[PDB]
Amino acid sequence: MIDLRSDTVTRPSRAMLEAMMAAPVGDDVYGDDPTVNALQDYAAELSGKEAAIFLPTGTQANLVALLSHCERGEEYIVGQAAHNYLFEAGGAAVLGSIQPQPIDAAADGTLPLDKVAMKIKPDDIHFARTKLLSLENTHNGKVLPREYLKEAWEFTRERNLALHVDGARIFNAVVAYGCELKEITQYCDSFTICLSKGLGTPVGSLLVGNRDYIKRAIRWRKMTGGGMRQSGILAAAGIYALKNNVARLQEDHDNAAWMAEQLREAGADVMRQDTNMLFVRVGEENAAALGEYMKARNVLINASPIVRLVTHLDVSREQLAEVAAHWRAFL
Amino acid sequence: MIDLRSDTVTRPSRAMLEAMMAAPVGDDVYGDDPTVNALQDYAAELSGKEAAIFLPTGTQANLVALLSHCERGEEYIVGQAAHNYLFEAGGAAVLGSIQPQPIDAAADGTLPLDKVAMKIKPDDIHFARTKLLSLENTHNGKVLPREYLKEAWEFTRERNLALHVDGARIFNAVVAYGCELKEITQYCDSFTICLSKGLGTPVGSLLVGNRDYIKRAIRWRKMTGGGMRQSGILAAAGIYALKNNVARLQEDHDNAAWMAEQLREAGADVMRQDTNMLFVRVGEENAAALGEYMKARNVLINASPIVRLVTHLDVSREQLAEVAAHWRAFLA
Amino acid sequence: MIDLRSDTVTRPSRAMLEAMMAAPVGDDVYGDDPTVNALQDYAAELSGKEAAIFLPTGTQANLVALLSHCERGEEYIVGQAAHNYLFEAGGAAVLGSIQPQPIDAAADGTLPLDKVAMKIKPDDIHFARTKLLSLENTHNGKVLPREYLKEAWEFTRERNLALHVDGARIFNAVVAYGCELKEITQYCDSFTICLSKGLGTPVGSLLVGNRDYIKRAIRWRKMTGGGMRQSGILAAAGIYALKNNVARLQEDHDNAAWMAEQLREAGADVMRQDTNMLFVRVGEENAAALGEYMKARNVLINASPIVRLVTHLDVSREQLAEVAAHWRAFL
Amino acid sequence: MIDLRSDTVTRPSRAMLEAMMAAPVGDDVYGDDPTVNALQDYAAELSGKEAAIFLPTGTQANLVALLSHCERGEEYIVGQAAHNYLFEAGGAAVLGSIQPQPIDAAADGTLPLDKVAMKIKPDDIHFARTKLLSLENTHNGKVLPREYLKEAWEFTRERNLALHVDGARIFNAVVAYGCELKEITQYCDSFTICLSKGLGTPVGSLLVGNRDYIKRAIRWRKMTGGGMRQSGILAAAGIYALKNNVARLQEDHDNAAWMAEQLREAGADVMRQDTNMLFVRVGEENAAALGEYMKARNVLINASPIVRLVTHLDVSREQLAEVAAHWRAFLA
Ligand SMILES: Cc1ncc(COP(=O)(O)O)c(CNCC(=O)O)c1O
Ligand SMILES: Cc1ncc(COP(=O)(O)O)c(CNCC(=O)O)c1O
Ligand SMILES: Cc1ncc(COP(=O)(O)O)c(CNCC(=O)O)c1O
Ligand SMILES: Cc1ncc(COP(=O)(O)O)c(CNCC(=O)O)c1O
């Protein structure tokens, strides 16, 4: 089965599984789980921050992050297509009583600071209270330019705004930068790390920031239902992935780039390729038919007028070649 | 004192006051106040709708309106510069647990239906549940084209979305249309009426829609703190304004149009005028200075790089001419 | 028409009306209404507090008050039968994201401090954050003992809790105390004043506390929809009532006490009488019939197995005597 | 290390671990994980209900449950000491916009229906809208009498109220009843199952009810952050526990009962024992000292004036005897 629906579909490797079953656990609510502590300590150190916490999903990681930054009546500026506004059911507004202020991102995935400044509300009773700027890196595969990350950092400091980045695929960005995570994370107050995607764990995300911030995050994680007990078995997979699965993300990027070439040669309208993602403009007429066509040959895609293809450790170039041939035959 | 800050600054006429003090009242919570009932019934009748309720402010009118349309987890599509998203402290999200979906309005004040359709969320657990489209008419004075109001009404029917319009200045649009309120209101499920602006009452707004909708709205008005007792004394001004102050809104429109002509001649950068509003592009350097200059001559404006001037029944053309002369002197 | 449903049914006197129509107004949002300012300044001075604001209803006064005291996730301890928990549709929870912690009040209308202390949550992620103690005075007519008001004040200070009192009928308490409002309000951080009841205005309530507190209250009043424009016409009635209608509340108390005597003589089960309220235990069998019986003779009551009778400036003893005679005939 | 803090501290057996690592997984968001589906289908089948969902915690299971039962402005009647009111940071009110109506439970852990009826709000705009009655079984170890569960189910039908039970320790009750889960679960619309306690899994709870209810619950689980991917590896432990660790809960009950007997003999004030829990009245002066005394001998308790001791598969009777000896020495 060839699955290009997302990098979320990754399955645990055997070495990862062996690490999961061998790890010492405890009750994380009591803070007694040594493996969860180790993962959190390692993630904080690796990113140059004071503290971190384990969460079941990236969705809760952002929900807890927004709650920890923004009070009732406060507002976060965010991308119209950003996950913690668009793809989390409006949790920040619905559950958190937080005003979302979405704006269109630039082509490079960046939220233009000139547009952000126009959205910063004056201290007047008619407006919500602008408190947070939320970024996404990578955003649909796109690696935000390093120069912007600095500019956004200084800007938020000058405007007394917090800066959070959704780093569900921040390690995809890191190897695209060719730098250390530390050199990127310095330009944010808090950020997330998804472990259950490209890094290939079955479950888990990380929220990392300063000590007092994370302390509040522990309260909100509890209320939202993320306070697990012996979650060290999951954290074990996270530790393994951070130490073994970061560098090999380059393979996913090369594969996606390779796949874009093959579909371009096959006559498909490849819109763009970024890291481990590639977007093909299939016909609205052809969308449903392509999905069914691929499904019949045991290839799984999310059928859509614009199809997103996502590479990961559970899809090789040999498998990509098979899909590309099916796509070619389809056209 | 010349006040061009807003039409909210309007004060009660002698006749409006005499109507307030003569009006029969009761406890509105028990529904025993004959004057607000009369106002609500009259507003519903005038708009071809089933029911209406009196509210203390237009802000609550919209807050209650969004609460009544959208459940927890549901979403309303709205303008980035629209009032019930931008100028009400985000109440719908903060108090109502409603996801806001703002989009840029077109130059004519309309929310382009092609972008609205792109913002309608699929029935998937990742998205909020799109339920409502909210419009604003007038929007910063701008009168929405009638053809769009029909198109938007039809569009929402096709997508099974509700349609609410912020009609704080809907009567300004009505006389600009030259039609009846009903002929505009037919293109929405619910809409608001502000009474405390151009119509010139001290307090009050109306929310009007169908019977079941308004019944839910009564529950939300109670929770938000708008369930008043003898508000008939306030409603009386509303009845008077609906019957006496609608036609003369043309005066405010002509004044704004005249002032725009006058300010252009005085050397000011007049950007646009729509109904009873006028927008001048003043220097950021000159913004604060102009305000202070005008304040020292008993003229009140909201000092800003872009100044919004709003005409109303408490500012005459003679007064506009006086202000225009001060503006001319300021630019010399 | 004789109306004993509530003191809310009071209608403006002519002198009050003449004051309403003569008062100077402005836009309160801009803070330009001199009459609203005068009322707020007078109420703050009279209560020994720094600031006050005008609101459309007592319900919003409490909703705004709870919002201004309690953040998202914080908790207020309150009576099970208290208005800002029971009779405001759960606004604090539904709109304000505030945990209510209701407890049974004592017979005297007091919330026992030993029970309050047991409800103060430890600083643990499993619990909401206890922040506020809310009192009600009067509570169903009952005047809370002065000694308790002090004890509750010291207790909340020692426990670092805020103390709010619903003073919708606090002036009924004041004349029952025979003291000044100032001597009662010293034992709270914030409190409310309803003007549209016994004081007899058509519309209005007041929220009064410290300067920073009220500043936050202005923001929440805006969001909740209480930011009126030329509300000076309503505030004018408030000023008149504070200066003319406080002392005469004694008449309402004497009338209610007199009425309790008459119904007791007529064979009705009068449960208790407090200030301008009295509660009669009519049959559940007789409840609907009594309501209809009184309605036919142009007497309005809230028909119920326990009927609450409320006196006010629009009901005299001559009218009370008529009702008592109807009640006597009914039995 | 002797841990009597809670049954949450249970660790995976070798066989449970081997089941986890052998289990087929997929993306649960896409619904492609065969093991959680198997667990959910099995839990629904076992309880005579239509559907079930896997959740990371019991807290989210209840939060999602209340969200799915009660809309914004609606109310759930619940115990003052109940978990989904007291021990979940008030999530239902804070996140869910749900009015909580707590009442004191009776000594037997039941919410007396006469007080419940007194808390059911009339359909009036002054009140929240009573919609749900939430129970807890077991409640601090206490097994709710079967007759009450039937009475409460019937009562809620008559009042058109929903009935949810917090069944974090429902299987402890089941073996205490000596009946089948179905025979208990029939008296509710929805209920929860914690897997990470007495059943001994590292992570997981279940929410089970009817198809439409659970479908709504899936939306709320997503928003609250419980929509995991390959959680089948976690669900595998749940399947193992349901099939192997239910009957042996009797062991925990006998242990707690034995410990209560043993501690009474040692001179401790044993207040009560119910299923796998035991409550001792220690001095407030001795509370902190006892904890430190036990901690220094590798015995973990939650030091408190009233100490809750909880037995589980990771504490033997031999270990209980050791602790009882330390307690005896402490009191001498
Ligand atoms: C940028 C980003 N942020 C947050 C999340 C949320 O992660 P969870 O699914 O673990 O909650 C996702 C997953 N989005 C779906 C996908 O890309 O396939 C994401 O892509
Ligand atoms: C279009 C619109 N809608 C709603 C409101 C809110 O009404 P209240 O302020 O009475 O709540 C206003 C007033 N907005 C401020 C102004 O234009 O001066 C408005 O202009
Ligand atoms: C103690 C108390 N507090 C607050 C309120 C709310 O006031 P509004 O009705 O102005 O919102 C009331 C009115 N309660 C209804 C009655 O006693 O008749 C009340 O009695
Ligand atoms: C009855 C009950 N319900 C729900 C929960 C919440 O489960 P999670 O902690 O897995 O979210 C607990 C655990 N309460 C803490 C204890 O008894 O140790 C509980 O005892």
- Domains of chain C and CATH, by start: 1-244 (3.40.640.10), 245-331 (3.90.1150.10)
Chain D's closest residue to C72, CA to CA, is D94
Closest CA relative to residue D199, chosen from D1, D52, D8: D8
Residue B99 identity: Q
Q: Are C169 and C6 in contact (CB under 8 A)?
A: no
Q: Where are the alpha helices (DSSP H) in chain A?
A: 14-22, 34-46, 58-69, 83-86, 91-94, 113-119, 146-158, 170-177, 182-185, 211-224, 232-244, 249-265, 287-296, 317-330
Q: Look at ligand 1, atom 13, and give the residue with the nearest C-alpha.
A: A58
Within 10 A of B265 (CB to CB), how many other CB atoms are there? 11
* Residue D302 CB less than 6 A away from ligand 4: no
Instruction: Please report residues of B whose CB lies closer than 8 A to that of A132.
Output: none
What whole-number distance in Å separates Cα of residue D172 and Cα of residue D204? 17
The helix, strand and coil proportions of chain A, stated in percent and rounded to the nearest 5, come to 45, 20, 40
Query: Which neighbouring-strand residues pair with A94?
Result: none
The number of CA neighbours under 13 Å toward the Cβ of A129 is 17
Closest CA relative to residue B315, chosen from B251, B264, B237: B251
CA angle C92–C94–C100, rounded 5-degree value: 45
What whole-number distance in Å separates Cα of residue A32 and Cα of residue B150? 63
H or E stretch including C271?
strand C270-274
* Residue A141, both tokens: 């595969």
List the strands of the sheet with C205-209, edge to edge: C51-55, C205-209, C190-194, C162-166, C129-136, C74-79, C99-103
- A7 DSSP assignment: G
Dihedral sign (CA B65, B66, B72, B74)? positive
What whole-number distance in Å separates Cα of residue C6 and Cα of residue C21? 26
Query: Experimental technique used?
Result: X-ray
* Residue B203, both tokens: 């307090």
Residue B297 identity: R
Per the omega criterion (within 30 degrees of 0), is the bond before A185 cis?
A: no
Q: Are C81 and C61 in contact (CB under 8 A)?
A: no
Closest CA relative to residue C99, chosen from D92, D111, B222, A226: D92
Within 10 A of A40 (CB to CB), how many other CB atoms are there? 22
Distances (CA, A) of D72 to A40, B226, D66, D141, D191: 36, 19, 11, 32, 21
What whole-number distance in Å separates Cα of residue B279 and Cα of residue B306? 7
Pairing of strands D205-209, D190-194: antiparallel
Q: Are B208 and B51 in contact (CB under 8 A)?
A: yes
Q: Are C150 and C187 in contact (CB under 8 A)?
A: yes
Residue B192 identity: T
Longest dimension (CA), chain C: 61
- How much distance in Å is there from the Cα of C205 to the middle of ligand 3? 10
Instruction: Please report residues of D whose CB lies closer than 8 A to that of C127.
Output: 86-87, 89-90
Closest CA relative to residue B193, chosen from B313, B83, B61, B11: B61
The number of CA neighbours under 13 Å toward the Cβ of C115 is 15
Q: Are B218 and B53 in contact (CB under 8 A)?
A: yes
H or E stretch including B45?
helix B34-46
Q: Are C217 and C53 in contact (CB under 8 A)?
A: yes
Supply φ then ψ for residue B113, to 5 degrees: -70, -25
Neighbours of chain B (3+ CB pairs under 8 A): A, C, D
Closest CA relative to residue D138, chosen from D275, D301, D283, D279: D275
* Residue B319, both tokens: 């007064």
- D98 DSSP assignment: -
H or E stretch including A51?
strand A51-55
What whole-number distance in Å separates Cα of residue A77 and Cα of residue D107? 51
* Residue C137 CB less than 6 A away from ligand 3: no
Q: Are B101 and B135 in contact (CB under 8 A)?
A: no
Closest CA relative to residue B248, chosen from B204, B200, B203, B201: B200
Query: Both ends of chain D: CA-CA distance in Å?
Result: 23
Distances (CA, A) of C21 to A68, A90, B202, B272, B313: 50, 48, 12, 38, 19
What whole-number distance in Å separates Cα of residue B87 and Cα of residue D183? 55
What whole-number distance in Å separates Cα of residue A45 and Cα of residue A48? 5
C-beta atoms of B202 and C231 within 8 A? yes
Write the DSSP assignment of B73-115 as a string of letters: TEEEEEETT-HHHHSSTTHHHHTT--EEEEEPPPTTS---HHH
Ligand 4 mutation target, pool D64, D197, D206, D308, most atoms within 8 A of CB: D197
Pairing of strands B74-79, B129-136: parallel
Closest CA relative to residue A231, chosen from A25, A59, A43, A58: A25
What whole-number distance in Å separates Cα of residue C63 and Cα of residue A232? 44
Distances (CA, A) of B40 to A22, B214, B215: 71, 11, 13
What whole-number distance in Å separates Cα of residue A209 and Cα of residue B55? 45
Closest CA relative to residue C293, chosen from C284, C303, C285: C303
Torsion of CA D191, D196, D200, D201, to 10 degrees: 110
- How far is residue D173 CA from its own chain's centroid? 10
Longest dimension (CA), chain D: 62
- B210 DSSP assignment: -
Number of the ligand 2 atom closest to the C-alpha atom of C29: 9
Dihedral sign (CA C6, C8, C9, C15)? positive
Q: For an interface test with D, which of C72, C74, C99 has the most D Cβ atoms less than 10 Å from its Cβ?
A: C99
Q: Are C35 and C25 in contact (CB under 8 A)?
A: yes
Q: Are B231 and C203 in contact (CB under 8 A)?
A: yes
* Residue B137, both tokens: 């008419």
Enumerate residues 6+ apart whose C-beta is below 8 A from D164. Answer: D65, D66, D69, D76, D132, D133, D134, D135, D188, D189, D190, D191
Within 10 A of C18 (CB to CB), how many other CB atoms are there? 14
H or E stretch including B242?
helix B232-244
3-state secondary structure of A247: coil
CA distance, residue B43 to nearest chain D CA (Å): 23
Closest CA relative to residue A200, chosen from A1, A2, A8: A8
Residue A88 identity: E
* Residue C91, both tokens: 């606004």
Query: Which neighbouring-strand residues pair with C280?
Result: C270, C307
* Residue D328, both tokens: 């005896």
Pairing of strands B2-3, A205-209: unpaired
Distances (CA, A) of B213 to B70, B219, C262: 11, 10, 46
Instruction: Please report residues of C whose CB lies closer than 8 A to that of A218.
Output: 125
Number of the ligand 2 atom closest to the C-alpha atom of C225: 11
- How much distance in Å is there from the Cα of B3 to the middle of ligand 2? 17
Q: Where are the alpha helices (DSSP H) in chain D?
A: 14-22, 34-46, 58-69, 83-86, 91-94, 113-119, 146-158, 170-177, 182-185, 211-224, 232-244, 249-265, 284-295, 317-330
What whole-number distance in Å separates Cα of residue C267 and Cα of residue C257? 16
Q: Are C312 and C200 in contact (CB under 8 A)?
A: yes
List the strands of the sheet with B270-274, edge to edge: B270-274, B277-281, B306-310
Dihedral sign (CA A100, A101, A107, A109)? negative
Within 10 A of C147 (CB to CB), how many other CB atoms are there? 9
Using CB atoms within 10 Å of the CB of residue B96, give its burial: 0 to 12 exposed, 13 to 18 middle, 19+ buried.
Answer: buried
Q: Are A73 and A128 in contact (CB under 8 A)?
A: yes
Enumerate residues 6+ apart whose C-beta is below 8 A from B105. Answer: B79, B80, B81, B82, B111, B112, B139
What whole-number distance in Å separates Cα of residue C129 and Cα of residue D223? 23
3-state secondary structure of D224: helix
Strands (E) in chain B, as ranges, are 2-3, 51-55, 74-79, 99-103, 129-136, 162-166, 190-194, 205-209, 270-274, 277-281, 299-300, 306-310
C-beta atoms of A224 and D63 within 8 A? yes
Using CB atoms within 10 Å of the CB of residue A233, give its burial: 0 to 12 exposed, 13 to 18 middle, 19+ buried.
Answer: buried
Within 10 A of C34 (CB to CB), how many other CB atoms are there? 14
Task: Say what the resolution is, in angstroms.
Answer: 2.5
Within 10 A of D149 (CB to CB), how many other CB atoms are there? 23
Q: Are A104 and A80 in contact (CB under 8 A)?
A: yes
What whole-number distance in Å separates Cα of residue D113 and Cα of residue D159? 11
* Residue C194 CB less than 6 A away from ligand 3: yes
Q: Which among B90, B102, B127 is the nearest to A102, CB-wise?
A: B102
